[PDB]
Design a protein around this nucleic acid. Structure first.
Lengths: 236, 267, 236, 267, 267, 236
RNA sequence: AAAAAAA
RNA sequence: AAAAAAA
RNA sequence: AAAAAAA
């Protein structure tokens, strides 16, 4: 305390300001598509393989690809070294990130295949899941995977009684609510929505609307990351 | 099997569900509390044919380094193989893990179990509360069935009175029991989005065809203590708003059943 | 002490008295067959699936179904919360319960399939394995699985130098021997026999004979649970 | 392979076994104790071609909260992949677990290892005895081979003399060794039921065709310390009675070999 | 795919490698240290397209009973699925385990991290150093990339100054940081044997066709702190001798890049 | 200290003396081939199965057998009882022992199959891996597996500033380097080479050359173990 | 295709 | 189809 | 084909 001075946050961000975000696509040689995101102190890499052969066969769906997501934090990504392994949290995040990406994907285009999304969090600082989904979309697009839209994501939250955009760790730690949202911006289709905290209906809804504005500005940044890539190939 | 989507969607278009429920109706609910008398608390919840048992067991242990002033609560969901052919033996899979965490969050973040009132010796000896969720028959809507059972079991829980003896420095566990400090009654309410329609308390057949799902957990005080869009699909902001509002309404109808069950077991 | 007064046990049971037993068949929607048993303070549910497709194929037997058993205690079923997971004991009990049920089953009727039996102990109080086998038989019969006989089971034991029927936890805890038996009553075929303790030959044999009389009375109760079910379907 | 059942059953009808053994004969037994000199005790047992090594290692540790007056004994059976193509790498499977537990029970429940004589400081420091069973070649009858080896290894065991120094309050581990307090010699004897015939010490080929199996573990004192009908099949009460009685007889013939091996390693 | 062996072997016969490197050339190396600012130390290393990140995190813990005068170092390599389609999720497989151990050995056995200078209270409180290796893109030669990253991250590491307060008896963690006691700079250099030819820093395409591989890890002092022939194949004694000698030469060229990166991050 | 007196080691061995080694082939009934080795206080058994059907099929190679190695220490094989389980060390040893044996094997002789090598260390006392590889070769030969050569192995090491042959535990414990080598002696082809310690180039090379002389004398002993076996079958 | 027993 | 090194 | 939450 105070996470909101007057009316500035500990890093000097205003209530509706995002942390600095940099994203880049095509950062891995092995992966079919990849994106790297630095979102505040988050440093996150996303890879996609392929659509690819799905073995065990039993897992195959006859009409469509399956999406598999693994979100993982590197041991050195958090203040207290994290034992490698997944953990309940990373498994749940993997689940909601899959559920965030799946609707953007035209999965029936590649029957019987897997699309594997990997999110490695190299440094964590609150908002890894929304920054992960954001890099994941980029990686899917980077993989040439046909998509209805990108998925852009951003968290809004409550700190010191006030609805704010894009919590950092400190703010989330001492905060009253964290509300990550992912959207497919073109149709305003919410593919991820979580709320950890305690809000009134009105608070919650303003958080979601705020988070979406944040997601929309992240979406501008994704498109620009994609444009960047298409300018790179336009050479020569 | 996929034949089913079309039937379910089309019925939905006619304002109908396969079992003649309204879009906002729960299947019949049965809550029976204190059924595992060995446990400190318990609740058997049936949402139609979905059945879940929750047992509360408490002991005394050390708090977490970071929170020496809070008792401990931990939530585990076992999707036992007998409950569903989709449930395989082994450690919790992502479904079980998400159910546990969302339900835990609903309780934790509403402080429905007040962990601060579970301290015996600050930094050294606190009550440890295991919310152990045994899903016995999966016929859809585990999330709500598990949260209803969890909070009903916590309300049912009677735990040994514990006293820190100031003279011997020992903690003494007495025979007399007391309730747990349960202060709020968060109830998840869960909707399936099927096409452009949300339907509360989706049965398995509805979960089989849904696009996506959203759970809103709310307490008596008008607060939301958890939200979880789960599975795929996408919701419109106005669908969420609808869900939140309808949640509060359905949660309240459910809280009344919970309090009734809780009170009945004291009869 | 004293677990045997004169000549009554702590709950007032005589030496050859069973705890109160209630059993009911068809309690689960998903399972192909199911039974619930309350045997003393044991509360146990048994489910059966199916005969069903057995994958991995390698596991299939060409001439017969396989029986698989999992016995499991819920965390809140015992005085000290039991970590979920199986454990050596529950794995061994699963093994002997399979070996208890298998002979009752006409497994060659369903080549290449699995019959999966699940016993969940919701509250434990000594005798869970024999009460589990008993509910398991009911669940197998409830599943329409052709059987040579039911399997009924009951434990006898030694407390304070005396051979008694159907130990509770206290008695088993402070007891000298526990002797569960399962039988196919029609042919007096013993499909489960264990002895944990220390007995003379004579003691052991009297325990087994006693346990069988207990199993036979449990068998009456199974048949009656099955009759109950066939009266229910006879409606209308 | 199934051709084998018919041959084995028919031979059995003629009072014969594939290796010309009687129904009540063990295959040749070799017990050699103290073979792993690093361990505190050990026994290599061969029942025909079945070979199992057991090593005893002891240390000092805390007793279990509930039993501050008892040392610790724990039994593990490794069905090592080299012993059998049916043995796969990984944690103990149900076969290994049942073998460990039945053999443990035979020793534990007969108090063959007297845990009360393994206390150094009540409630704080007891001897911890690991019975580690390494099955080296599975040619049938692991249960008896493992129990014979286990008790022979315990009889072979020499453990550091330990003294609680009453003045420094430290425990001192001396160079001088002493035996473990082994007071009974439980020996499992195991029968295969093949058709209507029980045959003691079934080889793998007999285990391949048996209906079921029963193990009776007995000590010198005429007591049964474990029984385990294992695998499927069914026994008649009179078959059990026969098994118990024949067990005591065969166990005694085996105890003599154990004591002889145990004594030989002291030569 | 096997078409590739023949092309690679034949090019090798003409003194050529697929990317026009000499037999003794590394692919371009990029070392960037201190990239994970939350960690105490870190290094991103790229050998061509092989990329590995290493993070150093330290805490205070108890030393191992046997070594109360040594801090703790532990090395883990995560072959994260994103790095390679050959990398599957789960606990470290033998590749990850061998990489960790060989790199650990290179550091440990050269005392490059001096564990003796990591003691706070002998026998009770030492620095614990986790070398956590996150392989991000596997394009061959993980061993060298991981060792370069590991030692560069250790050189980059700044850890809280810690003082044992002699009066309160407490350990105090200060804000001021200090380097770790890094005293040597072991660098693994790794050769693929392809036919009768060793080629340093094999790319994946070369690893795909190699007969075998050998890693020589050496420090500034002319000492070898680890050697590991890995995978199959066979080396001649004169190939080893060649490898050792060439290792020292290549390690030195690499040490210069490491020191430069390490120094640059202090700019 | 002193591990080198003048110039004798603690057990009286000279610097270039091997511990007593006994090896025997064909010691197991189940395994396709087996060898037992007592090398100093090492007691190690190696088994081979078969070439045999490799399931899961995906693992099969179309042109060749695969070799799989598991090295394992029994709990009672070491001074401090070793928890059963493999561990990083036993997994790495399994890996290098496979890489030690593979080149001796004509794997294309048995496409799509597995050759499974198992090394159980019954008592450990330094040099288990080289004694394991040595018994493994014998077991492979005992299995009738066609081989280009045996693989013989021996460790050399540095103790008290001096390069010595075949460290025992004490010497390895207080030693400066341990250098196991495996060779195919006929062509002097080094299939295993490890160095744990800290040596000069010259030290390391002399250790390797020494270890090879040790491996060559072990190889004589293998051949003699094989001769022994072929004399046994020559009866009658 | 990896420090138990009892409950 | 998930705090080591040595033994 | 097995004592958490936050990061």
């Amino acid at each position: 305390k105070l996470i909101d001075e007057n009316g500035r946050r500990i890093d000097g961000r205003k209530k509706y300001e995002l942390r600095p975000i940099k994203m880049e696509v095509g950062v891995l040689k092995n992966a079919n598509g990849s994106a790297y995101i630095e979102w505040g102190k988050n440093k996150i890499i996303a890879a996609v393989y392929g659509p690819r052969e799905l073995h065990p066969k039993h897992l195959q769906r006859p009409d469509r690809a399956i999406l598999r997501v693994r979100y993982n934090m590197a041991p050195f990504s958090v203040e207290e070294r994290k034992k490698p392994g997944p953990d309940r949290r990373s498994i749940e995040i993997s689940k909601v990130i899959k559920g965030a990406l799946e609707p953007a994907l035209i999965l029936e285009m590649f029957p019987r295949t897997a699309i594997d999304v990997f999110i490695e969090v190299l440094q964590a600082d609150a908002g890894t899941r929304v920054a992960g989904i954001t890099a994941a979309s980029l990686a899917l697009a980077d993989a040439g995977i046909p998509m209805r839209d990108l998925v852009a994501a951003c968290a809004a939250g409550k700190i010191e009684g006030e609805i704010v955009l894009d919590l950092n760790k400190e703010e989330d730690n001492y905060g009253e609510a964290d509300v990550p949202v992912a959207i497919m911006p073109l149709k305003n289709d919410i593919t991820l929505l979580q709320m950890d905290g305690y809000l009134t209906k009105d608070e919650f809804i303003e958080a979601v609307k705020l988070a979406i504005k944040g997601a929309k500005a992240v979406y501008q940044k994704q498109r620009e990351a994609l444009k960047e890539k298409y300018l790179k190939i336009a050479q020569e | 099997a996929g034949i089913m989507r079309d039937h379910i969607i089309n019925l939905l278009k006619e304002g109908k569900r396969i079992d003649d429920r309204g879009f906002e109706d729960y299947r019949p609910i049965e809550i029976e509390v204190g059924v595992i008398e060995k446990a400190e608390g318990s609740a058997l919840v049936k949402l139609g044919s979905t059945q879940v048992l929750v047992g509360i067991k408490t002991s005394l242990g050390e708090p977490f380094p970071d929170t020496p002033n809070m008792g401990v609560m931990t939530t585990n969901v076992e999707l036992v193989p007998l409950a569903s052919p989709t449930f395989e033996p082994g450690p919790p899979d992502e479904r079980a893990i998400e159910l546990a965490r969302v339900i835990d969050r609903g309780i934790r973040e509403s402080k429905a179990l007040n962990l601060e009132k579970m301290v015996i010796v600050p930094g050294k000896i606190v009550r440890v509360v295991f919310i152990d969720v045994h899903v016995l028959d999966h016929d859809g809507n585990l999330m709500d069935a598990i949260g209803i059972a969890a909070i009903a079991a916590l309300l049912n829980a009677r735990v040994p009175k514990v006293r820190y003896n100031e003279e011997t420095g020992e903690v003494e566990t007495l025979d007399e029991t007391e309730p747990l400090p349960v202060e709020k009654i968060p109830v998840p309410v869960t909707f399936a989005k099927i096409g452009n329609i949300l339907v509360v308390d989706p049965s398995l057949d509805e979960e089989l065809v849904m696009d996506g799902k959203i759970t809103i957990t709310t307490d008596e005080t008008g607060h939301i203590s958890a939200v979880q869009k789960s599975e795929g699909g996408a919701f419109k902001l106005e669908e969420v708003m609808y869900a939140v509002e309808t949640a509060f309404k359905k949660a309240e109808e459910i809280r009344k059943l919970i309090l009734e069950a809780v009170e009945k077991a004291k009869q």
